[PDB]
Design a protein around this ligand. Structure first.
Ligand SMILES: Nc1nc2c(ncn2[C@@H]2O[C@H](COP(=O)(O)OP(=O)(O)OP(=O)(O)O)[C@@H](O)[C@H]2O)c(=O)[nH]1
Ligand SMILES: CN[C@@H]1CCc2c(ccc(O)c2O)[C@H]1O
Lengths: 230, 331, 278, 52
């Protein structure tokens, strides 16, 4: 009777001591969700059931999640990832002609569905526009207008950043493709979350510094908005 | 050809059960005196989880219960003295369900890894891992000490043999993801609610569907039998709860209000079946009168949405969990 | 003057009690940042409860009747409450600085035990500069008028030396002022940099807020506490230039600042819904 | 799966079902009989309440 209560309290204190240790690790780790649209090269990005990976840069722990065990058009499980730091979206920008409703429009529809979600209403998205080299190759080779009629009246932005030795056609193509996502991102945003688009290729090696900087910007903007300074 | 006969068969079923509706449930129960106002107050508050809570299950002794959370823990509480008994760390941090054995010697778990894990409490280490589902697990209940039934997101349910780790039988027939299940008091039949706005009645011994109920219009999130065993209640994300009768093969009453527009996460009955407790996405729970479809009480002491709910076997307390990493006991 | 003085007391007490009871009653406001706000609210509540009514009675009756010991006790409580309230704003500014400038290490840097230690240290330093140098008679002036004031039983006025009037003023005001200025300049710089970064990326598809917020925060505090801490040094450096009425008026203007902190640091939507629930 | 769907409908449609009045009466009788031992309906005294 009297000894039973003492034994119960001894085990509870030991358990609570360990729970304090695990709280430090949980609060210092950043969770990321990786998404893709079919054949998009997202496996190459992570190369260099559910699958989890661990990596660390500048003594900061990141932990990425890739879902491949569930394949459906209704993502009922997506409400679990409402506390992640950011979402990584990988799309192949060079698949406008491929129909196997072409792939680019389906990716745009998926992005629109994800952005306007009741649970993911405060989560930012890091956008990777993969496969740039072969996109430029097929653009140089002898038409986006045959699939995207709005391209017939597009002009390259004045405040653009063309790469060195770049034909002004491929730059217009990339900026058109990026603005397609950017207009959806800015159409229904109230400052609670933003989008960070990047142009990516296979030979890129600085894809982790980009994620680090984008997460830093996300957290800093969150704090600035919280303290009524933004 | 084949599709033509399907429409004819579905037509007579509607006509067969249309002639059986002699009167409504509410018409019979107009003379019953109302239950009146019901007020409940929080007795205990359990703290220690680092993240939101998705699952909860009471014990057969009505003293201990288990809970699951996204941080990767499986904590067993002591509701009387508020003392943690066990803390099982999980290999996978994504957990969607948990169960407590009737004997009290084992606890099950599962989630986004498509695996069900059984733990040994009286030895704590993993005792068995069940594999074969191609979708995320949604629920699991213990039939006995050696067999267990599970539902997953691949539109199928299975009955497992824990000793050998092999599926004894598989239940097919749904089109969308299966979200919940519940066992009968005699452990011979069970019901399942899926995302195609339908509920089915299965036979554990035989392995084939008996009846189908399609009164809803949205994803069904929860399901629970009447204590008698001849009726059950469902809850969808269109702010409606419905009562279905097995022997009448049709629904009897609906529970809805014009001031409620959120979804429903969980449902449960009381000891006598007079009350129906349902959790909502609007941060609080509601208490209904089963035979009248009118509200009788509100439990509004949670900061974020309620995800789970349960009632003790003796019917002495009600436990609710939410996404603010808190558990509360209402008496 | 009685009506205005009574209204000021009610405003200070009513606002501070509401903030304290809101944090304790609700479990969603238990935050490391809110502990500093709780300490500040307690400081201003004690100020409004103790210092102001007795000063008002002394001004209205033109005499002191409680004795030669309660006068010193009242002066000590005055200095203790004034010093501890200003030093908490510095802690809040440093907290925001660490939150914004170093976002990855903010969780590791600040812990509840660390917050408690910081609060206790602030209160100890505040109490070590008010009760100790006053109850030990280390601040007393030496001129004849001060001697007569100390000897008199019904007279309770403030006379101090050069050393105390310099050290107490410096500790209470001058270091926190420069620390807050340095913190908030960098906070504004970071906010402006992020605002400029947002426009290049998606500017064609669409710093007043930060300027207004920082202006309010710094302006209310400076305009409330600067003239008094200037005349405190000036009236000791040079004699017969500030009348006692100016000193009392500026001190009371400084006292008024205790009633504005709930309006500034408790405008969050969570605080608004907490007040609505109560 | 065209043939399987029709076969299930035929098996399910050939069942004997009772009228709604009998089921409602049975539910009402069960509730009325077992409502005595329902601690949630009528609060129990604090002497016999383990949670208070
Ligand atoms: N030229 C070029 N080829 C690429 C690039 N990324 C992927 N590929 C090719 O596409 C193939 C697919 O690569 P994976 O890493 O498996 O990507 P994935 O299979 O499409 O990823 P998922 O379909 O989402 O599973 C690879 O074998 C590469 O040869 C790229 O950036 N540039
Ligand atoms: C009589 N009023 C006192 C006088 C001097 C003084 C005050 C407050 C803080 C200080 O550091 C001081 O040195 C005033 O409240």
């Amino acid at each position: 009777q009297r000894n039973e209560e003492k034994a119960q309290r001894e085990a509870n204190k030991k358990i609570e001591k360990q729970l304090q240790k695990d709280k430090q690790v949980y609060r210092a780790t950043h969770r990321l969700l990786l998404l893709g649209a079919g054949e998009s090269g997202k496996s190459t990005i992570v190369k260099q059931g559910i699958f989890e990976t661990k990596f660390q840069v500048d003594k900061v722990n990141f932990h990425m999640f890739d879902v491949g065990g569930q394949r459906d058009e209704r993502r009922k499980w997506i409400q679990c990832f409402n506390d992640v730091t950011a979402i990584i979206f990988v799309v192949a920008s060079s698949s406008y002609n491929m129909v196997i409703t072409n792939r680019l429009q389906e990716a745009l529809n998926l992005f629109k569905s994800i952005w306007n979600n009741r649970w993911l209403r405060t989560i930012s998205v890091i956008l990777f526009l993969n496969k740039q080299d072969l996109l430029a190759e097929k653009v140089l080779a002898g038409k986006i207008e045959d699939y995207f009629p709005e391209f017939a009246r597009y002009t390259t932005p004045e405040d653009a950043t063309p790469e060195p030795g770049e034909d002004p056609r491929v730059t217009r193509a990339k900026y058109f493709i990026r603005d397609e996502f950017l207009r959806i991102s800015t159409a229904s945003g109230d400052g609670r979350h933003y989008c960070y688009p990047h142009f990516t290729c296979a030979v890129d090696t600085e894809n982790i510094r980009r994620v680090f900087n984008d997460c830093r910007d996300i957290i800093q903007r969150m704090h600035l908005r919280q303290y009524e300074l933004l | 050809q084949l599709r033509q006969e399907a429409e004819q068969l579905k037509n007579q079923i509607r006509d067969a059960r249309k002639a059986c509706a002699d009167a409504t449930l509410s018409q019979i129960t107009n003379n019953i005196d109302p239950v009146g106002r019901i007020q409940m107050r929080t007795r205990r508050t359990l703290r220690g989880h680092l993240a939101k809570i998705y699952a909860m299950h009471w014990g057969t002794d009505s003293r201990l219960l288990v809970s699951a959370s996204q941080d990767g823990k499986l904590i067993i509480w002591d509701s009387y003295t508020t003392n943690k008994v066990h803390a099982i760390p999980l290999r996978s941090s994504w957990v969607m369900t948990c169960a407590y054995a009737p004997s009290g010697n084992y606890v099950a778990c599962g989630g986004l890894d498509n695996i069900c894990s059984i733990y040994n409490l009286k030895t704590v280490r993993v005792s068995r891992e069940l594999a074969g589902h191609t979708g995320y697990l949604s629920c699991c209940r213990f039939l006995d000490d050696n067999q267990i039934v599970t539902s997953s997101g691949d539109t199928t349910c299975a009955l497992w043999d824990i000793e050998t780790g092999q599926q004894t039988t598989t239940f097919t027939g749904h089109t969308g993801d299966v979200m919940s299940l519940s066992l009968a008091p005699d452990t011979r039949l069970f019901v399942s609610g899926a995302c195609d706005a339908s509920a089915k009645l299965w036979d554990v011994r035989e392995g084939m569907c008996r009846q189908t109920f399609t009164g809803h219009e949205s994803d069904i999130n929860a399901i629970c039998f009447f204590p008698n065993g001849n009726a059950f209640a469902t809850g969808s994300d269109d702010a409606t709860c419905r009562l279905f009768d097995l022997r009448a093969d049709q629904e009897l009453m609906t529970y809805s209000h014009d001031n409620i527009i959120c979804g429903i996460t969980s449902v449960s009955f009381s000891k006598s079946g007079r009350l129906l407790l349902a959790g909502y996405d609007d941060f609080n729970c509601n208490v209904w009168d089963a035979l009248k479809a009118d509200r009788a009480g509100v439990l509004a002491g949670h900061d974020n949405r309620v995800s789970c709910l349960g009632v003790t076997d003796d019917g002495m307390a009600v436990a609710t969990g939410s996404w603010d990493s808190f558990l509360k006991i209402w008496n | 003057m009685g009506i205005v003085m009574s209204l000021i007391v009610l405003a200070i007490v009513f606002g501070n009690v509401l903030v304290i009871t809101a944090i304790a009653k609700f479990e969603r406001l238990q935050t490391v940042t809110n502990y500093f706000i709780t300490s500040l609210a307690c400081a201003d509540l004690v100020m409004g409860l103790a210092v102001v009514p007795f000063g008002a009675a002394h001004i209205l009756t033109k005499t002191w009747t409680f004795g030669n010991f309660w006068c010193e006790f009242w002066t000590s409580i005055d200095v203790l409450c004034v010093t501890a309230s200003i030093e908490t704003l510095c802690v809040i500014a440093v907290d925001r600085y660490f939150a914004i400038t170093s976002p990855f290490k903010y969780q590791s840097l600040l812990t509840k035990n660390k917050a408690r230690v910081i609060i206790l240290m602030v209160w100890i330093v505040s109490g070590l500069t008010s009760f100790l140098p006053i109850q030990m008679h280390w601040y007393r002036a030496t001129h004849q008028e001060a001697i007569n004031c100390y000897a008199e039983e019904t007279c309770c006025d403030f006379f101090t030396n050069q050393a105390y009037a310099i050290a107490s003023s410096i500790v209470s005001f001058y270091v926190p002022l420069v620390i807050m200025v340095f913190v908030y300049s960098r906070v504004f710089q970071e906010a402006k940099r992020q605002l400029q970064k947002i426009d290049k990326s998606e500017g064609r598809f669409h710093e007043h807020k930060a300027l207004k917020t920082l202006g309010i925060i710094m302006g209310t505090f400076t305009l409330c506490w600067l003239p008094f801490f200037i005349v405190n040094i000036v009236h000791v450096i040079q004699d017969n230039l500030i009348r006692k009425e100016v000193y009392i008026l500026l001190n009371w203007i400084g006292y008024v600042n205790s009633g504005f902190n709930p309006l500034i640091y408790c405008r969050s939507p969570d605080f608004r819904i907490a007040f609505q629930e109560l | 799966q065209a043939r399987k769907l029709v076969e299930q409908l035929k098996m399910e449609a050939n069942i004997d079902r009772i009228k709604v009045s009998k089921a409602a009466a049975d539910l009402m009788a069960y509730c009325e009989a077992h409502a005595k031992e329902d601690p949630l309906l009528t609060p129990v005294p604090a002497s016999e309440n383990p949670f208070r």
